[PDB]
Symmetry: D2
Subunit: 208 residues, 4 copies
């Protein structure tokens, strides 16, 4: 359903649903359905002065597929609703280019290979424990942090902008940056005025 | 959808995201079995999937009802500004029947007139103050708690159900019970499966188990 | 610590968990004191504040007991990331006091009547509403119903438990000339107590994060 | 007050604000009191009984927890609280892993002796960790190298939570339906809670506790 952006080798960010648009913030700000452009001007005004409450009335629901180490960083954003999966087994294997700029003792290709290898061994050990009757909740603890998980994320535009301020930044890990770029992309698509105003006055990051 | 409450109040649905299937989709992270799922989640206390259904209501209510309402913190509220917003200057005047049930020294319709009288005296003093040059943020402090205010309320289904458990109940003041009934009505029309499961498995209040819709 | 506000209000500190060091321990995720270093610890507080790392300050918590007019309480309660427990108008026995603006309050606005008259006019209507209320009560009318005729300047009381992070957001918005003068007075008192208990955080706050105007002008 | 959990974990109390009376004062919205336990604890039961839990939001705890990441992930799903997890950016990083005891597999008829499963887990852990160190040695930054480490790697965090949110936590984790590992951490949390707020804790078990192991 709807927009879908592939991230990393097997990940993605999919837009499930969206409630409202830029006008939803305007209506809430004026507190009126009948008496809900001077409107785009209002959006900028609210953003400039930090009147963020109206933006809480725009809501998004995303379906995200990401490695657990990315999900854990993501989940630290408490002002939102999450529902994580609880079953296929895939892992994020960094591409050689990911090691861009680092003078590694061994070739990038080899680093990618070493990572694929322990992932392989951990996974085969997991399947073995399972086959012997070991409980899934127990056997799964040997699986690596690059294992892909999936979750639904329902978040309002205000909370989404705080999310972007922290993750859509060069100081954030590249992997999470990629997901934040995808989220920003969808946000931009569905709320042009809010997103533009956000970049103009409130965006604290540097990659957008 | 706009349901009139009390003498001048109302509850109006502004927008809504998703429906019963949004919770099923969230639960699975992906016919009659979907209904079975909704029922299962409700029966075992798995409330998180219902956070993926969201509503935005426009409510016009007396400030004393609004204040009680705002205690439900897991939601978003945007109310008119007492300092700068234009108001309708309307006030909730209880009907004689509202009193009936309590032994009073004077007729219920008398209690109604006295309330309407003091409200009239307060309002008059307010305008007198405004015309005199007194700023609204100060002049409005003399207006009574039964003055009507308006606000936008964006809330997810899980939180909405928690609100109904507490407000759609005999222990809550009659005025807010009336609003909770309107909220429940709209909730039912938009999420019939979640609503029925809610009544059958999680509703802690009492009035919705007897009051239709 | 109890500070009077307005004519019959106040802000009173009930309790507090932690101090500046609580944010430092949380930032380092360490319950080790055998390495205390004021210099380094105070530097970390500035660093966190300067770079917007707010989560550590969530581990410092305050509980205040506030007495304020309902119109002030309404504005205050819009700060949702905190816990509030207010007196019950339906049951709790109120003391029935009201905020009567001082003539100086209006002093500064062109009025068609002496500031003194406004004060008298407000005091008069309050008295009338209050009497009606009692008159309704003496008739057997439930207070949850009779209290609706009471004006918005009626005083209420509530306990407020908030962490330092949320407290700073509150000050950013309320300890500012844009906020109503009345709530500004309460915010200054909250800031005074906050400064007393977490001097390092308060200073770093004023230096790197405070968005308002008045706290950099008015002492403590 | 510290309680060891699992093989290398623990739960320790860093701080606490208030006690049973903090909820009482909040409920009554009054700082003073003067002299009455019988009345105080009756109010506490009254509140718990009728579901009036806002007063309990005025009792706060700060815990320091050491737990395997898979347990932490479940724990962090409780949003009404404040968390700060260990970071090499402010503190030194440690590398330990949760190795299940053979007993953990009791009740399960596994074709592999429980004590051998324990062995296989340690085996994979040791190899993943060695690969990790090797990647570090080659010049791979930690943020990338650590992705090969297992979910049983131990982490640490500070957790500040009020009594109300704490009771909800127990209702979901201090129960036979929660994974065993988290049940053990929840038990420790319940123990510290009982110690600092005996009245609230007693009332909780009597009228509201939804779990079964407590």
């Amino acid at each position: 359903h709807h927009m879908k952006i592939d991230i990393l080798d097997k990940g993605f960010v999919e837009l499930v649903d969206v409630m409202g648009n830029d006008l939803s913030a305007v209506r809430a700000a004026r507190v009126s359905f009948d008496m809900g452009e001077r409107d785009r001007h209002l959006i900028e005004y609210l953003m400039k002065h930090g009147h963020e409450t109206p933006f809480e009335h725009i809501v998004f629901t995303f379906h995200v597929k990401a490695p657990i180490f990315v999900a854990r960083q993501w989940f630290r954003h408490r002002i939102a609703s999450y529902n994580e999966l609880s079953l296929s087994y895939e892992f994020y294997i960094p591409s050689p280019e990911r090691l861009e700029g680092y003078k590694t003792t061994i070739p990038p290709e080899r680093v990618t290979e070493k990572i694929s290898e322990i992932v392989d061994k951990a996974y085969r050990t997991y399947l073995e424990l399972i086959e012997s009757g070991v409980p899934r909740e127990v056997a799964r603890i040997v699986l690596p942090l690059n294992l892909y998980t999936r979750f639904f994320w329902t978040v309002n535009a205000r909370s989404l902008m705080n999310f972007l301020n922290l993750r859509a930044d060069s100081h954030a890990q590249w992997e999470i940056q990629q997901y934040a770029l995808a989220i920003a992309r969808i946000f931009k698509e569905k709320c042009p005025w809010t997103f533009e105003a956000f970049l103009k006055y409130a965006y604290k990051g540097d990659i957008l």
